Amino acid sequence: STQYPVVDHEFDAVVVGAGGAGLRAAFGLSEAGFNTACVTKLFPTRSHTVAAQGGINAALGNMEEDNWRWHFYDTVKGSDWLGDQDAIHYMTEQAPASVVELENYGMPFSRTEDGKIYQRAFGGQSLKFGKGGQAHRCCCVADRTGHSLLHTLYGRSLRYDTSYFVEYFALDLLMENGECRGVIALCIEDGSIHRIRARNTVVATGGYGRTYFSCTSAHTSTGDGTAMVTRAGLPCQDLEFVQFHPTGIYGAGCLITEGCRGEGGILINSQGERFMERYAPVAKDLASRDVVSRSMTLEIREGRGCGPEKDHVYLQLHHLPPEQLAVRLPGISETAMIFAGVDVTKEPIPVLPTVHYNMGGIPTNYKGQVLRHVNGQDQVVPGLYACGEAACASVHGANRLGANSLLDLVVFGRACALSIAESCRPGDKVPSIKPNAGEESVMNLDKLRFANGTIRTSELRLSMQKSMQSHAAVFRVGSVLQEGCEKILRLYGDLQHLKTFDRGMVWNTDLVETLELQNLMLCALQTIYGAEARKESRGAHAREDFKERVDEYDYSKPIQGQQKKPFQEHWRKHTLSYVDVKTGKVSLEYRPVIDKTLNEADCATVPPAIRSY
Amino acid sequence: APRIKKFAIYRWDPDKTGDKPHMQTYEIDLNNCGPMVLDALIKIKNEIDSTLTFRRSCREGICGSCAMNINGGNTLACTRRIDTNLDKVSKIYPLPHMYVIKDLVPDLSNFYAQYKSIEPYLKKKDESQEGKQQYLQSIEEREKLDGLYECILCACCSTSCPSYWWNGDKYLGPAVLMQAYRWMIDSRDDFTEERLAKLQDPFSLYRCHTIMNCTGTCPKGLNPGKAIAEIKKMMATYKE
Amino acid sequence: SSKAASLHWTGERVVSVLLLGLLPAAYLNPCSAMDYSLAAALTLHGHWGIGQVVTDYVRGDALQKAAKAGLLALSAFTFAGLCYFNYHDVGICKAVAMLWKL
Amino acid sequence: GTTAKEEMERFWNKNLGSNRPLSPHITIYRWSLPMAMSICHRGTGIALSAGVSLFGLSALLLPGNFESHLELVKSLCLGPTLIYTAKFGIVFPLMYHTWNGIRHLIWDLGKGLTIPQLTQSGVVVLILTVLSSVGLAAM
Numbered sequence A: 001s002t003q004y005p006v007v008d009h010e011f012d013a014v015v016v017g018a019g020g021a022g023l024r025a026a027f028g029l030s031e032a033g034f035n036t037a038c039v040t041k042l043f044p045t046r047s048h049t050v051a052a053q054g055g056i057n058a059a060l061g062n063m064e065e066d067n068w069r070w071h072f073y074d075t076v077k078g079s080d081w082l083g084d085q086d087a088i089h090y091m092t093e094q095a096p097a098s099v100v101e102l103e104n105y106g107m108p109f110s111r112t113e114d115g116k117i118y119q120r121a122f123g124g125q126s127l128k129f130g131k132g133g134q135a136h137r138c139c140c141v142a143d144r145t146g147h148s149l150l151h152t153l154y155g156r157s158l159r160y161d162t163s164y165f166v167e168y169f170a171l172d173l174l175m176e177n178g179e180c181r182g183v184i185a186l187c188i189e190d191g192s193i194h195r196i197r198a199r200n201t202v203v204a205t206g207g208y209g210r211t212y213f214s215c216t217s218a219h220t221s222t223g224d225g226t227a228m229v230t231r232a233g234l235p236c237q238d239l240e241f242v243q244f245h246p247t248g249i250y251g252a253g254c255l256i257t258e259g260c261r262g263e264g265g266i267l268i269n270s271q272g273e274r275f276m277e278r279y280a281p282v283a284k285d286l287a288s289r290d291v292v293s294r295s296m297t298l299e300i301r302e303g304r305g306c307g308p309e310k311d312h313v314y315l316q317l318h319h320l321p322p323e324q325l326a327v328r329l330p331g332i333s334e335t336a337m338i339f340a341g342v343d344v345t346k347e348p349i350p351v352l353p354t355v356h357y358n359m360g361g362i363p364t365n366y367k368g369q370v371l372r373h374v375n376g377q378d379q380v381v382p383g384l385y386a387c388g389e390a391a392c393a394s395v396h397g398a399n400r401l402g403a404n405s406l407l408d409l410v411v412f413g414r415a416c417a418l419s420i421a422e423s424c425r426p427g428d429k430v431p432s433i434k435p436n437a438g439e440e441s442v443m444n445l446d447k448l449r450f451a452n453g454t455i456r457t458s459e460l461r462l463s464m465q466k467s468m469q470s471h472a473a474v475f476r477v478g479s480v481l482q483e484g485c486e487k488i489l490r491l492y493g494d495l496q497h498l499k500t501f502d503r504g505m506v507w508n509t510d511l512v513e514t515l516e517l518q519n520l521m522l523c524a525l526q527t528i529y530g531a532e533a534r535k536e537s538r539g540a541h542a543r544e545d546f547k548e549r550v551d552e553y554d555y556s557k558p559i560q561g562q563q564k565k566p567f568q569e570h571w572r573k574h575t576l577s578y579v580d581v582k583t584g585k586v587s588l589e590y591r592p593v594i595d596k597t598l599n600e601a602d603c604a605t606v607p608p609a610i611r612s613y
Numbered sequence B: 001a002p003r004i005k006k007f008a009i010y011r012w013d014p015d016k017t018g019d020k021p022h023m024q025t026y027e028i029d030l031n032n033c034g035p036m037v038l039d040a041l042i043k044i045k046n047e048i049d050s051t052l053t054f055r056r057s058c059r060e061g062i063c064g065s066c067a068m069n070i071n072g073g074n075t076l077a078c079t080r081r082i083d084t085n086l087d088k089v090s091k092i093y094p095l096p097h098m099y100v101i102k103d104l105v106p107d108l109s110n111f112y113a114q115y116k117s118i119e120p121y122l123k124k125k126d127e128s129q130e131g132k133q134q135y136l137q138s139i140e141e142r143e144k145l146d147g148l149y150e151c152i153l154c155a156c157c158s159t160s161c162p163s164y165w166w167n168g169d170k171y172l173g174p175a176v177l178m179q180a181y182r183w184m185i186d187s188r189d190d191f192t193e194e195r196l197a198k199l200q201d202p203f204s205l206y207r208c209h210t211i212m213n214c215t216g217t218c219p220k221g222l223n224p225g226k227a228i229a230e231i232k233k234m235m236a237t238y239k240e
Numbered sequence C: 001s002s003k004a005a006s007l008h009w010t011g012e013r014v015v016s017v018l019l020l021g022l023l024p025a026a027y028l029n030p031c032s033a034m035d036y037s038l039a040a041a042l043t044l045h046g047h048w049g050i051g052q053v054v055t056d057y058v059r060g061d062a063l064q065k066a067a068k069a070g071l072l073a074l075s076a077f078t079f080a081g082l083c084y085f086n087y088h089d090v091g092i093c094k095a096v097a098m099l100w101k102l
Numbered sequence D: 001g002t003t004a005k006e007e008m009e010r011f012w013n014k015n016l017g018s019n020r021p022l023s024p025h026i027t028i029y030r031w032s033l034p035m036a037m038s039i040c041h042r043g044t045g046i047a048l049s050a051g052v053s054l055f056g057l058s059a060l061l062l063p064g065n066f067e068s069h070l071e072l073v074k075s076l077c078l079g080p081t082l083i084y085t086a087k088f089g090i091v092f093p094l095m096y097h098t099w100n101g102i103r104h105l106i107w108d109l110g111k112g113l114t115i116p117q118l119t120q121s122g123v124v125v126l127i128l129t130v131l132s133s134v135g136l137a138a139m
């Protein structure tokens, strides 16, 4: 009841997250003179970004000569024109300044003959706006880019007086009349409950990949922010767009970097054919993530399955110089052994497309301001920001380009901090909250803390995971999505049959993983219903029944002589999902993609077209 | 065709009045389990007992979350594959000489605070020009960083150094020490002398007596001791 | 930067090499000067050696300062005695010789 | 905003004011050759320093010269192999600490600090101990 002691805190800002995005935003605020709190359930270093391998994109032109505007082109193209071009302008432009900031922070990038940041080839990247051949702009710390990045940022973060709430589990946002007043969180260490309130709040909680049975992401990718936003009655955007990374270990589903392919790696089927040379003649196995894994999954259907079960594919590396494999790809070389017993110098890795990245998340400005959808128009939610995988300024659209999330993180983390700095002053009036506020979060906590029902958390979690896995995979049909939809909705009902066993205040990992399950459910529920509704094939979301890109026009031939379809008649628009928490009923809406850049003169708008690699 | 393994596991509930640190046994059909000790830990959590409390995340060995004493040695539960030998009972403990918050979850606040004291970030005498151009560093100068930058602050090393057991407050320990060295040999760093000058007391660096448990136990295959030796040499030979 | 620590450390290694040299040196040259230099090296290295063991295990201001005091006394008593033995008795090189033929 | 030093104090004030146990250390840690050879160096080190100290102090506190003390020892049943053994266990600690001390100095230079190079060196130190302790008890 009032069994829980409430401790109240006062700040200028609160950042929820200590991943790349979280940290960059956190000390970004401190640096601008803001009394800042950062709230994270993991120790900052443990955050998922640490796992990141490939690299971080900037048009620095260390390998060849480059233009950030070519990076811009690549990103919008890859996004299948569901990507908001204003945000892509802002990102791809700020890219070199952002990478340089990191290197100047201390990030130990691999180095060229010039002793400049080494860059490498990556999937779906070109020179001269898709013309002048393969681009080499992915900046990397050898094989462990995300590792270094996170530590570098963490290291740097120690320099400022940010108040850190480590191993605190954020429960909900403190919401008062459409405005964000702060957060409410559980202190895992002693079980006490904390109301951290601030004038501004940043959500940087990363993705919800754990909604699936097989995914490359951490056990802590539980869409905790997405859910918090959903519980506030705010929209989440484009959640049906889930990235299936081509190359992940057949067993434990650990990620093997795309940098493997950018370093000369090849993809091979059961009869040895480099099947990717036939599926995408120009770019080959350095095409998009959605095209490559589409091809892989298809080759398995075809019959060309590999291994005893004929249910995976081979990523070949053995033909590459061993010097190169040691220098350019040490991290994978080791875990290829550890998890598969594979020597990369002599034999191919057993790979399978698995869930990897959440394009969708919280709708956002190019400024990082969280948006709601009032009267078919956009609206800035006062005191609310979001960045990283958690967010969706959809700078990534329908398909996220390789090595763009690490970029996303730092760019928009910084952006959030700048938006606050440039809108208000530190030490300004911190908006007051009701004494009752956060009441139901504690009530929800208590109910879960003493749960006695028929079904245990792990059982229910496994049901949701296998269902999402079989009904919301690479390819999906209206019938299978339909079954999945009601399958999940029923499982949402089951949440009040929950069995918890642990009943302590300290480190109740039984209770949190249940709070994580409530969170994952909302994320899945919105993912699946959104998927069923989108009757087209755009980017990562491929429908068997509707294999066509449904735009305002038919961009296979020139426009004008064509009549423009009205808004709710085409599909080139953002999916906005809600859910009535009690019932679990999903309701959807739509907002238009942004096509105007930040300056037509500096960066031309790239109009939709046929998208082939 | 079954195949069962035994797991002896350290337990402690701070929320069960007058609970004393004790072991608890579980049994797992290894046919229904992934190869790693974590897989097992998760499987007993998910099925047999969810009062079992441990840190985990990446299940890949980069976050540094597992970090527990497994059969005498400190490694990562997601890295260590269990002994298929059914005759041996697997012994899982928390990280040695550390305060147990609950079960296999040790208070690392000191380990973290110690890392903060070395200032693990690049430092320039003139930082007015930062954020403009990428700093220069040869592929050679860069090589001096390999085997150093890879540390995942898992704390296996520091927490297997017997000097750290008896002097954990004032002695910085291998991981944290190796990191200071990691910033010492960074060409781009300007504060090399003052970094060394901070280890000028009996306790900070000089409790290391080359026992070499650190290097012995590092799940990431790193050599903290060798780096500590290198610091010791730098300390003796630097000028002022 | 009063390099007290890093000096003390090298000084330790300096006597450590010194004490190693004086062993075969004493056997190959069992003179009286070799008795005194072997007494200084012996008790110094031993005093710094236990000094380490002290700082490792002896917790507090009360205990740690006391243990150092009592160690300094023991060391002084040990060095003086070895000097005495060199002067008013056999000398440690011959004392080993005499002891060994037995 | 909190100092590394401020954090450390709070770590101690919290944990010493708690009822938390320390996880087991030596009682559960698996032993290895170098791990045992490190305390042996402390053992032999401490033992030897006690020997040297007992010698110097008795030379000041006890009356009668060394020559008479030796004759006092001769005045006793001294089996050729019981004078050998009573002497071997006086060389043995010294020879181990001598050899392992050399290894410690090679380390101080920075050489041989890999794990293979440590089991190799440890064994060599262990063998040399035996040979020099038997080759001096027979001298």
Ligand SMILES: *Cc1cc2c(cc1C)nc1c(=O)[nH]c(=O)nc-1n2C[C@H](O)[C@H](O)[C@H](O)COP(=O)(O)OP(=O)(O)OC[C@H]1O[C@@H](n2cnc3c(N)ncnc32)[C@H](O)[C@@H]1O
Pocket: A016, A017, A018, A019, A020, A021, A022, A039, A040, A041, A042, A043, A044, A047, A048, A049, A050, A051, A052, A053, A054, A055, A056, A145, A146, A168, A169, A170, A171, A204, A205, A206, A207, A216, A217, A218, A220, A224, A225, A254, A255, A356, A357, A387, A388, A389, A390, A402, A403, A404, A405, A406, A407, A409
């Ligand atoms: C899985 C993966 C992803 C990945 C990659 C390799 C793998 C195996 N490699 C990449 C690469 O080479 N280049 C690139 O651009 N991206 C790569 N990715 C994708 C990318 O790494 C991730 O999308 C990105 O790292 C996400 O980072 P973000 O800052 O958004 O946050 P996070 O690292 O996922 O961690 C989330 C943080 O939020 C806190 N949190 C979460 N829930 C809560 C609650 N309830 N309360 C408080 N805090 C919470 C966590 O503590 C964590 O710090």
Ligand code: HEM
Pocket: B209, B210, C016, C017, C019, C020, C021, C023, C042, C043, C045, C046, C047, C048, C049, C050, C052, C053, D041, D042, D045, D046, D048, D049, D050, D052, D097, D098, D101, D102, D104, D105
């Ligand atoms: C000439 C042969 C000897 C050499 C080369 C030698 C060298 C060393 C070295 C290198 C150490 C450990 C320092 C470290 O941890 O790096 C040590 C420990 C020590 N030695 Fe010696 N030593 C020798 C003989 C002796 C003798 C005869 C005594 C008796 C007075 C002695 C007393 C000690 C003590 C008390 C320690 C401390 C043990 C510890 O803290 O680990 N040593 N020695």
Ligand SMILES: c1ccc2[nH]c(-c3cscn3)nc2c1
Pocket: B162, B209, B211, D026, D035, D036, D038, D039, D041, D042
């Ligand atoms: C196990 C426990 C305590 C230990 N202390 C040492 C040691 C102290 S000085 C040189 N080595 N080694 C140890 C091994």
Ligand SMILES: O=C([O-])CC(=O)C(=O)O
Pocket: A052, A053, A054, A055, A245, A255, A256, A257, A258, A259, A357, A401, A402, A403, A404, A405
């Ligand atoms: O999401 C990413 O950019 C990437 C990824 O799997 C990698 O190549 O490491």
Ligand code: SF4
Pocket: B150, B151, B152, B153, B154, B155, B156, B157, B158, B174, B175, B178, B217, B218, B219, B220, B221, B222, B224
């Ligand atoms: S050096 Fe190795 S054992 Fe020590 S904290 Fe780093 S990864 Fe862990």
Ligand code: F3S
Pocket: B157, B160, B161, B162, B163, B173, B174, B207, B208, B209, B210, B211, B212, B213, B214, B215, B225, B228
């Ligand atoms: S375990 Fe130890 S005392 Fe030194 S060499 Fe390693 S830190």
Ligand code: FES
Pocket: B055, B056, B057, B058, B059, B060, B061, B062, B063, B064, B065, B066, B067, B076, B077, B078, B079
């Ligand atoms: S959980 Fe990442 S280290 Fe094992």
